[PDB]
Structure 1
């Protein structure tokens, strides 16, 4: 169906490890979208064909206001192209670098939108496993949308692929190569809530080896300005044992969330 000739390409929207993402417009309809370009040589060399297929399969079937749409794909012997919904206000990562820290209302609103999207995912036994600020995009009304489903799977799971970059958002069971389930995304939700309020993630460290140590031991502390309600939510989410982490309904119902968020369940 679709080919490169059907699109006019515009400015770079971002770069990932494999992803080179561009603004584009479809010629006949003038429909604006994001084109995610991957190089087949790099996909083959790293052996991550299966991840890309999972990304297309999982993300194209999901339909939720807080999850980014994937419309389709095509390829041309050197490259693969994913056709994505365009997120005009950019990444949460960028917003955090701009403002340094988010206030309690902004943070609780983002956490509510995340928990809604994740609740929808988990009801189909889909786990994302790569929730972090560079994979959270912002819609035209500033609403949060989860993206980059390349690491997503069905539960329960092991890990068959090498961990690439940062350990900062991964729970103990994942970095220790053990078995995991849905609760991995709840740990990440805890890490994000802390990073939003404080400006850096709770286990951050100068080396891989030391970050690993802080995560496995769950060593983190709070700055004085973090309030009692935020501390209670974060401490419940960052439990070493997965089964002790709250259910998403509990997060959505938590008193600090209900007091500060400006969106509903």
Structure 2
């Protein structure tokens, strides 16, 4: 066990191993507080996150276990990895606090956008390489957007901030970036969704890198649907049958029919290969969208594609997701995963 020291950082007691020095507050959501620090053991600048109320309810206790399982599995150049996880507790009996350690990242894709064709190829290639890995483990990200994609000092892109099923009705309301990158089937609850929702989000991000403008900046759910159908066309009888929601189906049929627009006349002056890839990502019927593995082999990425250096994940057991347990059982499973952690090479 390392030695721990205590300090107060903005109304909060932080108890951390001596290796972590120069702690300074960076931010706080409602799921925890984050400090920047220097890790003297590795020489990395790191983000230390202290979870808030990790075991306060069955829903929260399971969310904590879900986030630690996910971060411990992800071992890929284009995905955030777990550098460390610790608790000052010496036993399960006194376990209350969980701290997660990851690489401090540089500029996100909002900061980058706010670019040549060569830069767009390079950045979308890395997102797709990381998504081929995530999807191979049957994980859906569910929240891809520019603020969840950042590059380090060497311009290596990493996917962060996986959807832990955490978004509130309020957070998705109105003129908000939290909704602009979502597939219509998840935005309006049309049907059981799958990993295809992440490729819709990649199409929206790629469009915004090419034009410097949000593709579907809707003022609310219905305004954003009208922007979407004006570009890709209203649904045919084949997709309407797959909308299992009867009243969602009824509303779509109230809209005047519109054809798919010419993407060369929308993305004026873009590489014709970029236009072709956008037409394959931005398809209303999710069964028909291009997959990450198929997109890596598209001619737009000829300069970067190497099928011997696009790895897949180890198998990932998510049987816990359908298990019903008490708060103290989720808390014991979480404690076991904290004490068994082995740091990267």
With the length of structure 2 as denominator, give the TM-score of the two structures: 0.62
1:35-67 Cα offsets, whole Å, 9 max, x none, are 1233228x959x555334322211211211111
1:119-198 to 2 correspondences below 5 Å: 119-151=132-164, 162=168, 164-165=171-172, 166-177=178-189, 178-198=191-211
- Calculate the TM-score normalised by the size of structure 1: 0.79
1:90 aligned to 2:134? no
1:60 to 65, 72, 88: 72
Alignment length (residue pairs): 249
Which whole-Å deviations, capped at 9, do the CAs of 1:138-158 have from their partners, x for residues lacking one?
12211101111243xxxxxxx
Deviation at 1:106, TM superposition (A): 0.8
Larger CA deviation: 20-29 vs 167-176: 20-29
- The equivalent of 2:37 in structure 1 is 24
- 2:179 counterpart SS class: coil
Measured in 2, the distance between the counterparts of 1:139 and 1:109 equals: 14
Partner of 1:179, secondary structure, is: coil
Larger Rg: 2
Instruction: Please list every run of 5 or more consecutive structure 2 residues that lacks an aligned counterpart in the other structure.
Output: 5-14, 89-94, 173-177, 233-262, 308-345
Aligned alpha-carbon RMSD (Å):
3.1
- Which of 204, 212, 230 does residue 199 from structure 1 map onto? 212
Q: In the TM superposition, what are the counterparts of 1:82-121 in structure 2 within 5 Å?
A: 82-87=100-105, 89-97=106-114, 102-121=115-134
| Long gaps (5+) in structure 1 | 152-158
* C-alpha contact (below 8 Å) 1:167/1:212 kept by paired residues: no
Rate the CA distance shift 1:16–1:212 in 2: closer, same or farther, 3 A. Answer: farther
